[PDB]
């Protein structure tokens, strides 16, 4: 099983920015897509962003389009979730997870432990 | 887009019996691109079934499912205690966005 | 001559049928099987052959035939096939997914039904895992549903693996008793003795 | 006498295959030709050899193994063969009539499929005449199908000769993207540079 290290959760004021990372090891990174999914505490999971296995093709959910910016690197073997101007509805646990496909579609097999991300004033 | 759920079966069952899970599609999803997770209350979801007819790694044979066109069924043969969790619908393979339905809580009584 | 007619009678006309958890296995060898008497009959209601025709069934020689005799209810006769699921399938009998042979059944509401309940018959309700194909499990180990060991004692999360069958002549057909006698065919290096009538 | 594995796995685990109008060609040399890796790996379907058997790939010494890697539609996988003629084999990858080699293909729907539409795995639609065996046609030159001269401008009857199939995951199992590799080799005529493990 490939392990996933979700890291970079914290407390950030509304209108701030935060930098999540998900370190991954146990498969060929350039071959399978990375997905980014929220769950706000005690309510349903919602997908937020995804990135192709190569590193170029990306998508984002309509509530975070133009605020969230995904990126990756085949050198450090990790995916970044850079986000700006967070709102109160952006509080969640984030989970990084690998999809079965090289470009973002398909289902998610292995999932990180997840990280708390809190927005408050 | 593609809608789903139709989740009765949340009725609190007891350990060690057969439970069947309904999943109704509205457009007859193609290539049987359906999948099921389990999540226990405070841990990451884990995939159980994909291809709507293919078990993933690290999944006991206790889980099984089948379906085609508008109608899919996850059929768990019996119920060990760790199976008291939430199960999800997850249509995938179109404008990805990913998809998470309401769920199904099976509890103890 | 044609002699040593296979003893299909003793198994189809048996006065008592094994329970679905304790299912008999008769082994046929050194006899001519006159399947024509079986497949040209009338009472039988279900005869489903997988990979074999009942007309071709007259012209074969095989090493042995098994006769897996048991009693089930009407809703459970559909579970006696390759690739089936259900309580009876998952806790009493698997047909192999590549099964070759035939499944035969008939209603028994004249013999195996009683006015005050005939429960001599009994199915396996609880178990840890599913059977292997053609496995038989007659154990009376108390199922441990919880983590607390039962030590063969019944109680909370400690239930008998066997639930009794409710059988009355006035019961709906999906619950009335049925006799099933699964027939399988096997080929080994040993002499092929189960010939058809020719 | 040589003991150094060659990049077969690479040719197979290559991140990105090229389009079938511009199929790659690797010179395999100084190899121990461990073909166990190919039919030991999980999916690796349709292991079809011609003039050779898949199990007899370890008691041979080939002169010059050529690995040709590309991606095609699922329906065309059968046209990557000797004596075939249709759309794929006529103008993008002709096998010779006397091919000694192994064509290997596996479904790459999980890998070469865009749900927003895939427009990078081009194939050639129009060409005046068939390709001779092992010809690479990277020509981007426009093709005249009408009476109007194309004059370096694309338009009505002035097609770009190259276009992508488009690969959505929801496309029929018939036409999902299939990764293909073709192992050409010559038998005994020269000092062999690749030999099986012996």
Author numbering:
A (entry chain A): 1 to 121
B (entry chain D): 1 to 109
C (entry chain B), D (entry chain C): 331 to 528
Authors' text:
To determine the mode of P3E6 action at the molecular level, we also solved the complex structure of P3E6 Fab bound to Omicron BA.1 spike trimer by singe-particle cryo-EM at 3.2 Å resolution. 3D classification identified two major types of the spike-P3E6 complex, each with a similar number of particles. Unlike some previously characterized class III NAbs, while the down RBD contributed to binding primarily, there was a second interaction between P3E6 and one up RBD, establishing a unique bivalent binding mode. The interaction of P3E6 with RBD was stabilized mainly by three forces including (1) hydrogen bonds formed between K440, S443, T500, Y501 of RBD and R102, W105 in CDR H3 plus S30, N31 in CDR L1, (2) salt bridge between K444 of RBD and D57 in CDR H2, and (3) hydrophobic interaction between V445 of RBD and W105 in CDR H3 (left). Intriguingly, when P3E6 bound to the down RBD (type II), the interaction was also stabilized by another interface with a separate up RBD. In this interface, two arginine residues (R18 of FR1 and R74 of FR3) in the P3E6 light chain formed a salt bridge with D420 and a hydrogen bond with Y473 of RBD, respectively (Figure 6C, right, (D), right). Besides, docking RBD-bound ACE2 to the P3E6-up RBD complex indicated a steric clash, and therefore contributed to blocking of ACE2 binding. Structural analysis showed that L452R and F486V, two unique mutations in BA.4/5 variants, were distant from these interacting interfaces, explaining the high potency of P3E6 compared with P1D9.
The infection activates diverse memory B cell clonotypes for generating potent class I/II and III bNAbs with new epitopes mapped to the receptor-binding domain (RBD). The top eight bNAbs neutralize wildtype and BA.1 potently but display divergent IgH/IgL sequences and neuralization profiles against other variants of concern (VOCs). Structural analysis consistently revealed diverse modes of bNAb action due to their distinct binding footprints on viral RBD or spike proteins.
